[PDB]
Design a protein around this ligand. Structure first.
Ligand SMILES: CC(=O)N[C@@H]1[C@@H](O)[C@H](O)[C@@H](CO)O[C@H]1O
Ligand SMILES: CC(=O)N[C@@H]1[C@@H](O)[C@H](O)[C@@H](CO)O[C@H]1O
Ligand SMILES: CC(=O)N[C@@H]1[C@@H](O)[C@H](O)[C@@H](CO)O[C@H]1O
Ligand SMILES: CC(=O)N[C@@H]1[C@@H](O)[C@H](O)[C@@H](CO)O[C@H]1O
Ligand SMILES: C[C@@H]1O[C@@H](O)[C@@H](O)[C@H](O)[C@@H]1O
Ligand SMILES: C[C@@H]1O[C@@H](O)[C@@H](O)[C@H](O)[C@@H]1O
Ligand SMILES: C[C@@H]1O[C@@H](O)[C@@H](O)[C@H](O)[C@@H]1O
Ligand SMILES: C[C@@H]1O[C@@H](O)[C@@H](O)[C@H](O)[C@@H]1O
Ligand SMILES: [Ca+2]
Ligand SMILES: [Ca+2]
Ligand SMILES: [Ca+2]
Ligand SMILES: [Ca+2]
Ligand code: NI
Ligand code: NI
Ligand code: NI
Ligand code: NI
Lengths: 388, 388, 388, 388
């Protein structure tokens, strides 16, 4: 049966550690893919970690990072949550240098974007075979979320961008049923920039907190209804959660406009909690180091600076990276609401560290009814490796 | 339940990337079989990649290519599509230096040919056990498709050759139900040569596009009805798709006779599209380099040179190899027609490259309702390897 | 359906070898986690071995034992009983430096304790996702059994400790249904110390034989009824089974008080047999070497020294370690009673041996209706290893 | 449902290659157990290869053959037929230095014998847990078939020996239902010797062809009825099939007595075919080299030398070893009879070859309705290995 996913998101007081894969530590000797962009998504029976590989293993010469990011070797694969991204437990999903995946209650849908920058092809897989495609509509690196898509009542939703990485681009949201695209909508967002959306279901809609790589240090927010009407703006909260960003003191929030006048960014996430918001961010304002999650009172609807909870997940002495959202389905939790979870990618290697390679491992946290103590579930690998 | 596979083949405007296994890159450090002849076939639940191994792994001394091609160590194994042919995910299928496999809706049927050249034995497996055999009828390397066989209404069909590789041989098509051979027919084809047929279901018949290793640079075409009546000829199109071949300018097609007066060949494929045809070929006319797929208007029925679509899958600077056909079953696609897919083997190693070994990896494409941009999903391995 | 587990424990005359994983021997070349605290628990279909890893493999530099025992890399994983704790067969369970696990007839429940010593968080997983949490209530290394928990009539029971390792601490027993905590009770035990309980179902109650790390060389015994009323004392038998302990000659048992005036201890177990008891212990009184199991007449209820059976499982020349209890469910044995089983951890490496690492392998024995000869199923690995 | 296995064995004209695992070749680089005594047995869904390991891998120092054959590290494990005995695909079965296994239609039964030579314990597992035991009854290396046991109508049968390896011993046949021993019988066989029986179902009885290690160069034959009445004698045929043996010219058969006055032997097999017999033997009379299978007219009932078929499976230039029998169940073949299959172990290493280790790989053949050409599916590994 299809997952309804029409329930409200649970209001949570903290996040409990779900999984830690230790992939880089293991890959010092084991056979582990060099990966990037490792997200989690769940079916009615299990949660899986998805990741992009280059067909190269840690401590092998092919892990040499002299390739294009968007190479023809790049594929999407998956394992059970908490398993390292190792060769012998991996499930193939799609050829892809950009991806999203989600389960509709019956089967996995996966979208893998590959091909040339001027004319990329996004292939939709459903149940482990190709079922449809979207070609680039604007001829400039068609790309998508790098996290879980969202399925509601048997229809799956995701967001894609086509255009410049550093100025105005174009943004579309898509809807599919059983791997067949059955609707889309252009997102009108002049002056704004959307990349790498982290989405989740809440009250029968798809809520997304994305990345502005143009001028914004605050995050875009996009809310999509099943008929593909939408609301688009910025996360109202008077604290910024992109990286790089300015000091909190110097920041005034906006519900409507990018604030901060800085380029670049990092994939991140936020969860609406009635009118409040949980927002993730790196502890460092300038680098992808540390990770904390903050609850801001009325932060979804006002430019509030009223922080009511804070939890540290990775200390500021250790590397973080992308982060993203997903939910636990009711068929697993038996709850009356959808439980919010997030993952944090912890990047290791070049250029910040003296290795020839770059990969990442992950920590995954889920929302609970209790406050949880600060700690640091950092990567733990000792670099350099033998191949270096 | 048995797969009907009685539907027409879908008419497609292009092919989307399905899978890429990166097996050779992975096998630089991981434990991956040295393989040859890697085809894909699908059941109602999944597609699998089949391959021939020697019981030797990449970067080990046993990968030393000093063996007979048709050795007693050669076996047929399989993995899920997109998985590298690695030891720890592999399913054993048959002892075999020539093979074919296909699913009838209920179980996998596999045919593995092994034994001496003068008296080979082809063992039919059904459901993972031996169920029947065919001994050599002409005493000269009994051999078969090296790609998916075809099942229609619970009966499975395949083509075998027994005789010379470079002049007139003998050709038979077989029919089995539940692993028991229940019919066969001699294919009368004087002046013609059939090897390594790539077959697929279309409108309740088995259509095959094969390899002429005697004098033809055009491909034989064989159409088999369930009562084992047949039509045999050559692919009518006024472009040749074997390798080696002549220039397109110098070529005039024939529906009935080999054209080009050249020996040797490569396994390839074609799909009928009403009266049109999709045909694969290496980009190089002389070597197994590059891969393109061409749609020719009326090319199934006339000696047409009217090319209406072209798609590049592997650039001419990279190695290709065998290629073959399969279809996606209706129980997976939910379509009203059978979706055409193909795989391309990309060979690496000796003698063309300075290694002691030879193996291959694969790219798999499936037909879609959209044109897809040219690109190159080439192998990507950096040779030589450590063992070299 | 839920496991009833309301039957009496079987009365057994000896123990038969169930499994031996040879994990350390295998890990000389294979890819095997460095582990600690490897317990067994069974579902209606299978028994599994659970273990704590650091994300490091044998013969790799990360196995270097310079880490905190309670590190952020420590996780709980599992394999089928008798499989080595290898990377490619492992199932992720929880982030954890202390753990317990058990099956309720429908799904696995796992408890993983992680976080800082002053404020640890115990996460309850049910069916492979987080469902609840218990934070430290006394701010001093919240910790639990390191063996199977016990499920009766769909409700699962376990014991935790929070407080000092060498003097009076606090002890609580918990009850959960479907991963939700629905009851708890403070265990009043002044002058006593409880760690690392080995529990099993017997006649509809949870019987536990634990470790006193404060002053006792005899083992605490805790009996929990489903309404969380309890009885707590010490194992009556006039033989002591902790390590370190004194000579049997110098020992007089007590049902109520710690005896022996020695600190430290080892996780161990005992099984009630009507009024008799099977008790495990190291053969050495001073070190974790050898393992024997003794049946004492009336030893559950009197300070008896009447030994009626003895079986040696690991000779005194070889290293042992922790040991723990579990039962075989009726849905597997088809018996009218619950069959008692135990595992013995065999520790290898530093500091007792000259290596940089420490890990363990296991032997598992189950109760049978026959006496079984003494032998030694010791670890068997030859140290040092290459990394040393 | 239980397998009936009450049908007659099929009369077959030859044997077709089923599987070849190439385990030693693979283990040059992959992670493969050093094994001995690799037999095959089948359930209603699949055939599996069972094998004894020492917890040591090929090309590792623990493969050093300085251990006792009957060591405490020795365990029984299994993989799908045709898979190498590799770590990451292996299923644990039992602690064992002697073993047998078979499926009753519902679950696997396994018997593993371990413990000391004077007092060994044979543990019966059913459905992956221990269910019963047999202790040594004669105090001298209790041991069993090292091949498939036989299940008929839900009851499983096997043969064990306890006593001297080179003179009169004692022999018992056992019967179990659902892992519980429910009957046994002493086999009266004065002047005869029974080891390592190869058994199969035929017409509702268990037929066994065994090894005489005392004075016989002909093989014992034991036929067991479900009520544990039995007939015991020697294989009547006027050709001998043990190794070592004398020349065929010098041999006269006997239905009742050992012939040949030679010690030692090898595990082998034979199949009754009405009144005829298929018998396996090494081609060499003095060493375990080559393997052939002979059909002798009236060879089950008379001292016939009328050879009517011969098939070579391993040439005389290559090493063979143990061989054993099993059948394919009707639920797999859909036949009206039980199909006979056999496996041949091919031993490599010390002392015959200059390595520190000894292991084996296998070829498996099944009976078919056609004659099959001679060939040699020998091991293929190139010795010595790196560790040597
Ligand atoms: C350890 C290693 O592979 N280093 C190489 C380096 O020698 C080379 O200059 C570079 C580009 O080819 O790739 C990297
Ligand atoms: C690296 C390696 O194994 N090279 C060998 C070579 O020495 C030998 O001449 C040949 C034939 O045996 O096989 C190859
Ligand atoms: C073989 C090895 O890794 N040895 C190291 C040693 O050099 C170092 O002093 C210690 C602490 O860092 O960890 C260990
Ligand atoms: C390569 C290797 O391990 N060789 C050893 C040898 O040095 C030793 O004498 C023997 C007994 O310990 O075991 C073997
Ligand atoms: C990008 C890499 O750098 C240069 C060469 O050393 C390699 O072959 C490769 O092209
Ligand atoms: C074919 C190979 O070449 C020669 C020898 O070096 C090897 O043993 C092998 O026979
Ligand atoms: C604990 C270990 O010992 C010291 C250093 O050599 C390492 O980096 C590590 O910190
Ligand atoms: C049997 C083996 O030979 C001797 C020693 O070198 C080893 O430690 C082992 O005892
Ligand atoms: Ca930004
Ligand atoms: Ca040709
Ligand atoms: Ca103590
Ligand atoms: Ca003999
Ligand atoms: Ni799972
Ligand atoms: Ni699948
Ligand atoms: Ni199992
Ligand atoms: Ni199978």
């Amino acid at each position: 049966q299809f997952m309804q996913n029409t329930e409200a998101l649970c209001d949570v007081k903290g996040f409990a550690p779900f999984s830690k894969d230790n992939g880089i530590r293991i890959g010092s000797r084991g056979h582990v893919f060099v990966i990037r962009e490792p997200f989690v998504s769940c079916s009615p029976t299990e949660c899986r970690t998805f990741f992009l590989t280059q067909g190269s293993l840690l401590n092998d010469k092919h892990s040499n990072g002299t390739e294009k990011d968007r190479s023809p070797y790049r594929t999407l694969m998956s394992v059970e949550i908490g398993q390292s991204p190792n060769v012998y437990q991996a499930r193939f999903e799609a050829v892809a240098w950009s991806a999203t995946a989600c389960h509709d209650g019956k089967k996995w849908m996966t979208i893998g974007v590959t091909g040339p920058d001027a004319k990329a092809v996004a292939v939709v897989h459903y149940g482990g075979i190709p079922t449809d495609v979207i070609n680039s509509w604007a001829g400039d690196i068609l790309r998508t979320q790098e996290s879980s898509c969202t399925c509601i009542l048997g229809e799956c939703y995701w967001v894609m961008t086509d255009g410049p990485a550093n100025r105005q681009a174009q943004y579309r949201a898509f809807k599919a049923k059983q791997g067949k695209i059955i609707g889309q909508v252009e997102i009108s967002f002049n002056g704004g920039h959307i990349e790498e959306c982290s989405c989740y279901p809440n009250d029968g809609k798809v809520e997304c907190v994305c990345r502005d790589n143009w001028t914004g240090t605050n995050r875009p927010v996009l809310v999509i209804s099943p008929d593909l009407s939408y609301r688009v703006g910025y996360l109202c909260a008077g604290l910024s959660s992109d990286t790089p960003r300015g000091e909190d003191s110097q920041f005034t929030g906006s519900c409507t406009s990018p604030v901060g006048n800085q380029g670049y960014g990092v994939k991140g996430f936020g969860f609406r909690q009635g009118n409040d918001v949980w927002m993730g961010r790196t502890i460092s304002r300038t680098s992808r180091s540390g990770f904390e999650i903050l609850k801001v009172r009325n932060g979804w609807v006002q430019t509030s600076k009223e922080q009511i909870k804070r939890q540290v997940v990775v200390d500021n002495l250790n590397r973080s990276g992308y982060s993203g959202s997903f939910t636990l389905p009711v068929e697993l939790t038996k709850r009356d609401c959808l439980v919010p979870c997030f993952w944090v990618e912890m990047i290791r290697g070049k250029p910040a560290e003296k290795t020839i390679w770059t990969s990442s491992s992950s920590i995954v946290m889920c929302g609970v009814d209790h406050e949880v103590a600060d700690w640091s579930w950092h990567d733990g690998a000792i670099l350099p490796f033998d191949i270096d």
